[PDB]
Amino acid sequence: RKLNMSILINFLDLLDILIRSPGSIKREEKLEDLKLLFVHVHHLINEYRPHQARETLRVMMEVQKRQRLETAERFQKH
């Protein structure tokens, strides 16, 4: 959430660069700056990718277990 808000506020400050002094050095920094921010917003959510991976194994196992018991109960009724 911090990096989302930082991306938007640095876009507004880049608009302030384009309003006040377009020939400044800072815009090059600014056109680098939010780039670094965008990298981090990808780099955090890639860290959800192992977790998601592990978590899908967990729910698969739960569904696996449930289906076994369902067939057992189905068969026993028969």
Partner: protein, 49 residues
């Protein structure tokens, strides 16, 4: 025609200042388009990979 030239010789320096103005404003227009270009090169090249 040389007389027309030496007549315009009083008006030479104002046209020099006008060339300075035009160069400066063209430079700032290229700054705007360069900012938009580098943002596009961020959004379509570096973040996709």
């Amino acid at each position: 025609r040389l007389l027309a030239l030496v007549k315009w010789a009083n008006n030479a320096g104002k046209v020099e200042k006008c060339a300075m103005i035009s160069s400066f404003l063209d430079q700032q227009a290229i700054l705007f388009v360069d900012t938009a270009d580098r943002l596009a090169s961020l959004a379509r090249d570096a973040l996709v990979h």
